[PDB]
Amino acid sequence: DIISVALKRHSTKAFDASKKLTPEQAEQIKTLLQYSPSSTNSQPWHFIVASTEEGKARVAKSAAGNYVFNERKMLDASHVVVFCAKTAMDDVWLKLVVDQEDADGRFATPEAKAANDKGRKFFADMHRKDLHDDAEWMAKQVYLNVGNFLLGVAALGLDAVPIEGFDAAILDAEFGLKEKGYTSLVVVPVGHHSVEDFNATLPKSRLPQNITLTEV
Amino acid sequence: DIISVALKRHSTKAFDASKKLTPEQAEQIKTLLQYSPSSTNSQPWHFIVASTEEGKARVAKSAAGNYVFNERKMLDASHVVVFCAKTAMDDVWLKLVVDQEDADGRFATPEAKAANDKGRKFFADMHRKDLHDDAEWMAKQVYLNVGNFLLGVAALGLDAVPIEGFDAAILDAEFGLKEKGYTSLVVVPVGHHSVEDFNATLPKSRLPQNITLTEV
């Protein structure tokens, strides 16, 4: 069943502009985005969900130059999700997280809450103060969300395609992302594929496990 | 249904060492590892699946020290997956990939294969030659694999826990990954939680959508 989803799922190359998500599906994809796991529950992300013609047109502006070939996808799909990562890990965000966990009832005592904050604060520093790779660290969490989203959407019976071929400088500018602390990394149009999706009937291809997998 | 899977899964803090994956499930998680999508279908990864007592112990060594809280999870879980990313993208691997799609029958003509090879190399060179984010780029694809794997495993009725808290240098050394061209990124113990898993009862917590998601 889930393996069936994983084996039949595919990157749609063309969407049917007349096929939309049901209001229920639309709510579900947002839930998928929100509840993805992340290191220390950092959730260093922001998402832009374009579902209107005007909204999608703005996103598609990022599909120019060498990426015009991805424009149709953004324009024709039902919903287009823009996965964004924070550009820097700050204490105000760290406090926001632990406070949400607290409001959600994950701490039986203030010291348990302090212990959690110190733990998160410890790995955040290791990345920003020591390794100096917090941008990459948070960007990795976003991709993990993307991975969770792609399988999820497929299990909902919806078509989608993860997109890296777009101009992030344009996309960020179009939504003032940098001046808000974020930068776009991946774009994911969602909907139903059209008869023009040649990849819907092509066999899936992956390297043999004897190359990529070792058992011990 | 898959939404329920997303809302119900949780990071397992303790596993029951007596609860092993069935031969079928052990095979499904590998299928899961293999079929994750990736940019350009480059599949810049290698997986180490430890299931014997000795193998899991070797992986566990990487958690000794400042990551002791993650050590038990690695010894008690039925299967422990180590997600590794290629450390550099070489033309041999690009050759291996495009030849697999060919063997799997994704190209109807030689020009199609060449055109695909050309497109894949254009983005590979962009990352290695122009952006020099070659390693981070492949690492991100591995995380996308992780995200897909965590949802999939959960939908399989299995417990798991993503782990960044481990010494990658130790792990890399134990399995001679550096000379092999890979580096460990995240460890994922899979199995069934024991009554010791205090996180199986705590409520899940996530930041509000009114701050993380913009609709247009």
Ligand SMILES: Cc1cc2nc3c(=O)[nH]c(=O)nc-3n(C[C@@H](O)[C@@H](O)[C@@H](O)COP(=O)(O)O)c2cc1C
């Ligand atoms: C992070 C990421 C970015 C990618 N970019 C694009 C893109 O810009 N345009 C496109 O047509 N496909 C894109 N792909 C789609 C596929 O090339 C890869 O998912 C496919 O070759 C492996 O196939 P399948 O997804 O149908 O299973 C990307 C995939 C991932 C995971």
Ligand SMILES: Cc1cc2nc3c(=O)[nH]c(=O)nc-3n(C[C@H](O)[C@H](O)[C@H](O)COP(=O)(O)O)c2cc1C
């Ligand atoms: C890449 C990554 C690394 C993480 N590392 C660890 C770890 O080293 N130890 C641990 O106990 N939990 C670890 N977590 C689990 C989380 O703190 C958890 O994903 C999060 O707080 C949200 O809770 P949930 O997974 O139960 O939904 C990690 C999560 C991700 C995605």
Ligand SMILES: O=C(O)c1cccnc1
């Ligand atoms: O999310 C956690 O608890 C965590 C993440 C990285 C390292 N150690 C712990």
Ligand SMILES: O=C(O)c1cccnc1
């Ligand atoms: O997988 C692709 O086809 C792809 C990935 C990144 C950028 N452009 C195309």
